[PDB]
């Protein structure tokens, strides 16, 4: 029982700015991830367990970066690739984000174990970093993709093909945005903050700590402006924030630009090796 207002397409400057950001991210990320992965996984290898975690992070970033040209082409021109490629792109996009977030959480947990229980807990650290990590990160990330696996497809609108998510009704997107927030931002954030609080307390009463702290803060500083955009969009959807429709278009543009800028989490990983390493 409400009137509809139709979303208007992005401005021309946005239509030009998204492809260049995507191209820069692709060019940086492909080279950085290829180099780090190759060195870590083929010759010199890794001295420390944290480098092992970083390898999984690099693989996830590479998997994400592979799909960027499709994003740029869709942003500029129409969709031509096909339904299967649409599904694969959406599946990979959903996998990589959760994989990266849970790898970060695992790194924080390993730090916690390395700091407080250093003497007692070497065997648990090795076991967690060797065997448990697969079940911890790769299984739930794969499992969370079933909604995309069903509801992502290409639709024929006149002569234009659209690759998007076609949900049965409105509330599904609200539920999926809520799980996105709860699994990306809140729970791993709680774990990371609690772990670092305990390490700080123990220290009060380290080069490794600094290097893994900068990665996490830089990751969540990039992702933070996106999640307020999603939170507000969800509240607007549930008739809790009825500020009009110009506000809706503005927040849609904000979401688009902010995710485009936050795609830097794949590029951030290899740089820290160049600077800090």
């Amino acid at each position, epitope marked *: *029982m*409400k*009137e*509809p207002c*139709f*979303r*208007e*397409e992005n401005a021309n400057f946005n239509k030009i700015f998204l492809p260049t950001i995507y191209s820069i991210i692709f060019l940086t990320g492909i080279v950085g991830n290829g180099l780090v992965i190759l060195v870590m996984g083929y010759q010199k290898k890794l001295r420390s367990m944290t480098d092992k975690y970083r390898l999984h992070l690099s693989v996830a970033d590479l998997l994400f970066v592979i799909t960027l040209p499709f994003w740029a082409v869709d942003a500029v021109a129409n969709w031509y690739f096909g339904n299967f490629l649409c599904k694969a792109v959406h599946v990979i996009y959903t996998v990589s984000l959760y994989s990266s977030v849970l790898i970060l959480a695992f790194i924080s947990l390993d730090r916690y174990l390395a700091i407080v229980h250093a003497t007692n807990s070497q065997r648990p650290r090795k076991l967690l970093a060797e065997k448990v990590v697969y079940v911890g990160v790769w299984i739930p990330a794969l499992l969370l993709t079933i909604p995309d696996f069903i509801f992502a497809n290409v*639709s024929e*609108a*006149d*002569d*234009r093909y*659209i690759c*998007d*998510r*076609f*949900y*049965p*009704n*409105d509330l599904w*997107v609200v539920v999926f945005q809520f799980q996105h927030i709860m699994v990306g931002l809140i729970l791993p954030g709680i774990v990371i903050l609690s772990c670092y609080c305990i390490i700080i307390s123990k220290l009060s009463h380290r080069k490794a700590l600094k290097t893994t702290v900068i990665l996490i803060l830089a990751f969540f500083a990039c992702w933070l402006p996106y999640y307020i955009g999603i939170s507000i969009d969800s509240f607007i959807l549930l008739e809790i924030i009825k500020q009009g429709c110009e506000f809706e278009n503005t927040v849609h543009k904000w979401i688009s630009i902010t995710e485009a800028l936050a795609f830097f989490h794949c590029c951030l990983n290899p740089i820290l090796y160049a600077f800090l390493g």
Partner: antibody
Amino acid sequence: QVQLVQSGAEVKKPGASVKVSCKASGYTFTSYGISWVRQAPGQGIEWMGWISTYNGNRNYAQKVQGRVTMTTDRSTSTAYMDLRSLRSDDTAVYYCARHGITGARNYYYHYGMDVWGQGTTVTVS
Amino acid sequence: DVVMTQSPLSLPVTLGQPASISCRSSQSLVYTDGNTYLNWFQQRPGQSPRRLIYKVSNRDSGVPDRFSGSGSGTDFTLKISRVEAEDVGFYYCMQNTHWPLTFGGGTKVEIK
């Protein structure tokens, strides 16, 4: 194939209420809005409404607003339209035509008017 | 809303000869995106209207090459290269750019 099937023709007294079904099949019903178009006999085609099957965001034409409520039945993939307080000149033919496109990131309205229903005629006596 | 006048109202045509119908708008049919969404319908007597051409010139799949349209700005035209005996009926031009959509007056094609 994609197709829309309507009900039969009806005759009703003035002041009554009429509901015309619009069953659609051959495509995902929850990704295209539906617009209701009425053609008066011996007159130009006119528009009176549009409902989004995605989340029921109805919209009405100014000339008919206040006398029509139109809803969808997503479970059986059907779209209805209710008209009350019928007048003498309401005798016409009603067409159910797919309109728009609704999605998670795309909710435009300039992609449609492709497939039409068989149409039904209602008269007042 | 946008109002479109279609001419001529009655167009007697002779078999084997081309014919043209043109409708003019009151507001420019140019979308912010950069396209023009104006399409033409044909309604045979006793059945629902069907789509002939979508947008100014693109041809809807399933119709012969005889039907073709052109125009830009606020002037549009549809032309039939050859008129057969099955091209009798009403013709409408409508726009989908400005909410709400508006149809045309209607043109009836006879046989002369």
